[PDB]
Amino acid sequence: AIDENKQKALAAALGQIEKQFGKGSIMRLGEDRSMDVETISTGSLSLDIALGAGGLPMGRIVEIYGPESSGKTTLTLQVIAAAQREGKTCAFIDAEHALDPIYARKLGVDIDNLLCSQPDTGEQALEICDALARSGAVDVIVVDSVAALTPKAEIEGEIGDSHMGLAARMMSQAMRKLAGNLKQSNTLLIFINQIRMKIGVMFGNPETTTGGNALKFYASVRLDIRRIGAVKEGENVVGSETRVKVVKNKIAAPFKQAEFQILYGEGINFYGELVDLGVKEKLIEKAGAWYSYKGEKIGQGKANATAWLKDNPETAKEIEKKVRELLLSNPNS
Amino acid sequence: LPMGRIVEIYGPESSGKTTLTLQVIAAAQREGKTCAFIDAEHALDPIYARKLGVDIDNLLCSQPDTGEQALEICDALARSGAVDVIVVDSVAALTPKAEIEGEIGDSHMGLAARMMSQAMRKLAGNLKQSNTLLIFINQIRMKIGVMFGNPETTTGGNALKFYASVRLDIRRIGAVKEGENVVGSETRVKVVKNKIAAPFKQAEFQILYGEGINFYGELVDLGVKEKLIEKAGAWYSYKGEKIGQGKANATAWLKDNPETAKEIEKKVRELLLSNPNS
DNA sequence: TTTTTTTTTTTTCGTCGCCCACGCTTT
DNA sequence: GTACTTGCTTAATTGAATGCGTGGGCGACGTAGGCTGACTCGACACCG
DNA sequence: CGGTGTCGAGTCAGCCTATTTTTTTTTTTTATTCAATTAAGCAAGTAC
Numbered sequence A: 001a002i003d004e005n006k007q008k009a010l011a012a013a014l015g016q017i018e019k020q021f022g023k024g025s026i027m028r029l030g031e032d033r034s035m036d037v038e039t040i041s042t043g044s045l046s047l048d049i050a051l052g053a054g055g056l057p058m059g060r061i062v063e064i065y066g067p068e069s070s071g072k073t074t075l076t077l078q079v080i081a082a083a084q085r086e087g088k089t090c091a092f093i094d095a096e097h098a099l100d101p102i103y104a105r106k107l108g109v110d111i112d113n114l115l116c117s118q119p120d121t122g123e124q125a126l127e128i129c130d131a132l133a134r135s136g137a138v139d140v141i142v143v144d145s146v147a148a149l150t151p152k153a154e155i156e157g158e159i160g161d162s163h164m165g166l167a168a169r170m171m172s173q174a175m176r177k178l179a180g181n182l183k184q185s186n187t188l189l190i191f192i193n194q195i196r197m198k199i200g201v202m203f204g205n206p207e208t209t210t211g212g213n214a215l216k217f218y219a220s221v222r223l224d225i226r227r228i229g230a231v232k233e234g235e236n237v238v239g240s241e242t243r244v245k246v247v248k249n250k251i252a253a254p255f256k257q258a259e260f261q262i263l264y265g266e267g268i269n270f271y272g273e274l275v276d277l278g279v280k281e282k283l284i285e286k287a288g289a290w291y292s293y294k295g296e297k298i299g300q301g302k303a304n305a306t307a308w309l310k311d312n313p314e315t316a317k318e319i320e321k322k323v324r325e326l327l328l329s330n331p332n333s
Numbered sequence B: 001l002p003m004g005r006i007v008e009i010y011g012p013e014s015s016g017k018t019t020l021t022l023q024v025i026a027a028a029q030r031e032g033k034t035c036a037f038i039d040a041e042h043a044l045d046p047i048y049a050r051k052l053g054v055d056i057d058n059l060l061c062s063q064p065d066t067g068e069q070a071l072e073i074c075d076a077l078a079r080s081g082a083v084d085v086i087v088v089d090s091v092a093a094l095t096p097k098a099e100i101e102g103e104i105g106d107s108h109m110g111l112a113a114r115m116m117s118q119a120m121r122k123l124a125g126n127l128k129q130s131n132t133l134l135i136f137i138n139q140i141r142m143k144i145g146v147m148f149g150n151p152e153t154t155t156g157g158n159a160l161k162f163y164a165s166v167r168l169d170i171r172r173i174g175a176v177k178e179g180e181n182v183v184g185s186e187t188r189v190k191v192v193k194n195k196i197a198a199p200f201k202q203a204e205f206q207i208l209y210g211e212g213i214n215f216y217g218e219l220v221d222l223g224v225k226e227k228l229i230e231k232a233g234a235w236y237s238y239k240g241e242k243i244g245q246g247k248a249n250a251t252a253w254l255k256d257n258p259e260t261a262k263e264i265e266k267k268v269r270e271l272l273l274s275n276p277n278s
Numbered sequence C: 001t002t003t004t005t006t007t008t009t010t011t012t013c014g015t016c017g018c019c020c021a022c023g024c025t026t027t
Numbered sequence D: 001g002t003a004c005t006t007g008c009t010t011a012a013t014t015g016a017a018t019g020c021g022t023g024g025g026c027g028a029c030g031t032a033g034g035c036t037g038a039c040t041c042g043a044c045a046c047c048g
Numbered sequence E: 001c002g003g004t005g006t007c008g009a010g011t012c013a014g015c016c017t018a019t020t021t022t023t024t025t026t027t028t029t030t031a032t033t034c035a036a037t038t039a040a041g042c043a044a045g046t047a048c
């Protein structure tokens, strides 16, 4: 009697809404397959575990920030490389004007299929993101530094001229327009960002990022990448020891961190991670500085152990399959 | 929260604004009420909602294209008299149609403020007649060229401040750790406007990731405050019996002694909730 | 029974949006 | 074996890490018309 | 006989057309990690 009139008035309003605005304009959340979270590999296996869902979410915005020469571009090109290996189309908006296409090829990016723009203004760069997002043909877009997205008024102006909150305003407007378009297209958007200092502050952290407050809110994931040491062959510095902290996560629990090696010319050391993950999950035994798999001594030191797993791709397939089985927190299906 | 009214929840990024609204909807669904979620931000995970105790199969969801579409679905559902709670996730993401059709860089002076002002006029009356709660979530922005005031603002202009019957300011104030593993957030809500009762009271609670609000953690702190639980440094004791060392052990005790929990809840309600139910 | 003639005068506002960036030893 | 004093365990509380000092703006339309420049088009004068 | 350059007519996007005011406000702010330090309960050591 009471419950019956409500069910009818609901059905009528759902009819009236779907009439006015189109068919999927309102529905029950259990029946919406568009609203399910789908991920893409980062290249790093330690980072796929730290993110909890097994990688970066499609249809969302992601921010990567950090200090100078910390691996922000290199990480972002390993995401594209792994995406192109699954027949996805990718775009690089290079606002910093500093992409070396030979390095991209050495990291395993298919140069010949990667779309690239070196745009004149910030407004031009963000209009090309909206055009590619609406198309539904591109799967991953990267925007290298938002620090470098100069508004048109600032490019036509003189050095010294004040433009109060202009880049902030442009980013606020861009997120409003993009968020919805990226979700309909199932397109991933990765913003790279530089660090700056905030002055006349209390005792917070003095580090900021460029481009205002909008992108913090709209980002589904935020990563903070840092160089924490050197990788040496005696004298020759051959790479960087790198730490990534998940500073915001809406698809799984945050404040997990990943540690891996970037080697100059190859990129992220995949077999290096697989050792450390093998040790942690008691599939590899560490006796001081001696690594042992099923009794058989694979090597002495991490480099020799890594070199062994290179030579035995059956053993490396076996351990990868096992670690994936165990340690992934939220496997989708 | 008052039925037939408008509520505003604002705060910084990942402070617990969406989590809190989903625990309201979960509670309302357990009293057989119908709820709706307008997701203008395009960032709801249905599996997280289910873990917080929402019935996913009876929760109406809209991912609207424009701000005017979003606010016309709110007006349609309000007039129906069928829906009891509506949540609109970010006001900041309610983009007007001129701005969507336009180019990036185009100025639309006071367009979103005007849209919001108009919506408040049309909604206020329809919600009261239907006895429908409307919760707006808002993001923070910064004012520039200001000395008189604090520099924090909210998006969408000045209408919503005036029409809101309750305004909540939610902030993360620390971590919850199991030694090393950060397992949750320590959270503070200030009641910044209130027409239903006296304002400026605050609430402190824990959000535990994949669980939601820590009920038993609050019940410990309220016990201590109302003298029903005895605290000695870091030692919590109910009627002599040492129920644990630290807040986490005490919380784990009240989980595995559910009769004691119901007895303490009943007394805390009797004392501090001075609006007895029908 | 015969046959139409010719215009007159305004009324009222509605609404914000956005940060940006260190500088420097002292014995 | 039971009663009295101290060490350690685990947790939470409060202080301190600090050093002090700021100034900059610009954008429109619900609704209108006339002028100006720069753009486009298609055909003929001239040249190969 | 076709291609290049020039001529004239027609059309799209931007912009410019001109007052005020007497000259205001806030009620307070945001925030963060590491260390020293302290205090009560259980177990260890001591005493009857």
Ligand SMILES: Nc1ncnc2c1ncn2[C@@H]1O[C@H](COP(=O)(O)OP(=O)(O)OP(O)(O)=S)[C@@H](O)[C@H]1O
Pocket: A066, A067, A068, A069, A070, A071, A072, A073, A074, A075, A100, A103, A240, A262, A264, A265
């Ligand atoms: N073309 C290259 N060849 C060899 N090593 C490189 C090359 N480009 C970058 N690297 C190294 O890889 C590491 C990370 O470099 P990036 O990935 O460019 O860092 P980044 O975070 O983009 O910082 P920025 O761009 O300069 S603003 C650094 O140690 C670089 O020197």
Ligand SMILES: Nc1ncnc2c1ncn2[C@@H]1O[C@H](COP(=O)(O)OP(=O)(O)OP(O)(O)=S)[C@@H](O)[C@H]1O
Pocket: A216, A217, A218, A248, A249, A250, A251, A252, A253, A254, B012, B013, B014, B015, B016, B017, B018, B019, B020, B045, B048, B185, B207, B209, B210
């Ligand atoms: N799907 C999830 N799984 C586990 N934890 C989550 C998930 N979603 C959010 N959280 C955490 O719960 C806390 C509050 O998250 P939210 O309630 O989404 O915050 P918010 O106030 O909506 O701010 P925003 O939406 O990012 S603009 C944060 O520490 C989140 O990282």
Ligand SMILES: [Mg+2]
Pocket: A072, A073, A096, A144
């Ligand atoms: Mg770079």
Ligand SMILES: [Mg+2]
Pocket: B017, B018, B041, B089, B137
């Ligand atoms: Mg939210």
